[PDB]
Amino acid sequence: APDREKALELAMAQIDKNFGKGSVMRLGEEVRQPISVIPTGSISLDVALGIGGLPRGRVIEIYGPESSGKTTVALHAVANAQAAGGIAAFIDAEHALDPEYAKKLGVDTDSLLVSQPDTGEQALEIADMLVRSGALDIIVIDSVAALVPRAEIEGEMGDSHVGLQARLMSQALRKMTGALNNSGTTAIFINALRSPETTTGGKALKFYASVRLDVRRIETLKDGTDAVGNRTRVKVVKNKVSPPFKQAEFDILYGQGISREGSLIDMGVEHGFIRKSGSWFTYEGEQLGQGKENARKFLLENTDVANEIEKKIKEKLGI
Numbered sequence: 639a640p641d642r643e644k645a646l647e648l649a650m651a652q653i654d655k656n657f658g659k660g661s662v663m664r665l666g667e668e669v670r671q672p673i674s675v676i677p678t679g680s681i682s683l684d685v686a687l688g689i690g691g692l693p694r695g696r697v698i699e700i701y702g703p704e705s706s707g708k709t710t711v712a713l714h715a716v717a718n719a720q721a722a723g724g725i726a727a728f729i730d731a732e733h734a735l736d737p738e739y740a741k742k743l744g745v746d747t748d749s750l751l752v753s754q755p756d757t758g759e760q761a762l763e764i765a766d767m768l769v770r771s772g773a774l775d776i777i778v779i780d781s782v783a784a785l786v787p788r789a790e791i792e793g794e795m796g797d798s799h800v801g802l803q804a805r806l807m808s809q810a811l812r813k814m815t816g817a818l819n820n821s822g823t824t825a826i827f828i829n830a831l832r833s834p835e836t837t838t839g840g841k842a843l844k845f846y847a848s849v850r851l852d853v854r855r856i857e858t859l860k861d862g863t864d865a866v867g868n869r870t871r872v873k874v875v876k877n878k879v880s881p882p883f884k885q886a887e888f889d890i891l892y893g894q895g896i897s898r899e900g901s902l903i904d905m906g907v908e909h910g911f912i913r914k915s916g917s918w919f920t921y922e923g924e925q926l927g928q929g930k931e932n933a934r935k936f937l938l939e940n941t942d943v944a945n946e947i948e949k950k951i952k953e954k955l956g957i
Contacts, residue, residue: 660878669880676722676776676824679714679743680888681901681948683851683872685955688880691718692849694775695822696879697815699782699843701829701836702853707870707890708828709735710743711853712778714895715826717744724775727751729765731758731784732830743895758785758803762810769825770817782807782829783837808842815846850876859889861931867891889934899937902947903930911950921947 675691700708716726737747755761787802831837852873859867873885889900906912919926919933926933937944
């Protein structure tokens with residue numbers, strides 16, 4: 639009577655119907671539920687996520703050591719959302735954002751809502767208020783670790799209460815998540831951190847998120863001796879809308895955003911479109927150059943090509 643696959647599907651079926659789509663899923667499975675998404679700004683990452691970009695109306699956490707490339711991504715997200723004509727909110731509690739660098743990645747600073755909370759409750763709440771107005775496409779909280787409870791701030795944390803922050807984070811996230819889902823507003827909590835300590839607030843953020851990104855830096859992009867930027871690596875450690883654990887890499891040159899041409903030269907190679915002979919790159923006849931960098935330039939100057947690689951790559955996968 640038992641037909642494991644017939645019995646297994648029926649099991650998964652109920653499981654989703656009981657806890658939500660994606661509550662369980664074969665890793666090879668290839669999701670086909672196209673959800674509204676905010677493009678990460680890194681094609682590779684956008685594919686790693688398995689749905690094009692950050693899922694809308696979800697809580698997204700981006701953690702990693704300082705300079706890992708978190709903000710950048712985050713900034714890009716805002717940027718792509720504004721192009722889709724969405725409004726963006728930035729609950730700043732670190733005062734580091736450099737609007738100028740933002741404008742560079744495509745952000746419309748002049749139309750960006752910004753708030754610099756006096757307390758942690760204040761911040762989270764201000765956010766909650768903004769979210770439930772259903773007007774924002776995306777909201778990004780800078781530094782989970784900075785949402786220090788009011789009590790701790792005022793200096794009354796005289797060893798008379800402890801752990802207050804997680805709670806602050808947990809309860810806050812209990813409320814907002816709901817509202818978020820209805821508004822469709824994506825919320826990116828930038829968790830610049832410090833296994834699994836979580837800087838005091840990732841405890842509750844670990845369960846409320848639907849997508850958790852692990853941003854890390856792996857190598858300094860060079861030519862020969864002179865540097866040009868750094869290659870970041872991300873690992874979607876959690877994904878409740880597509881098979882998790884995939885990962886992508888992308889280049890960010892000093893002062894720039896996620897290098898399109900880089901992504902091109904990267905996904906081109908693995909995918910076959912662009913061939914690499916030792917220390918050289920070639921694209922169906924044409925020579926790109928000796929070394930990823932000259933190639934990058936090459937693709938920067940010859941707009942048509944590359945634009946066509948983006949094409950072929952964008953075809954072999956969903957564009």
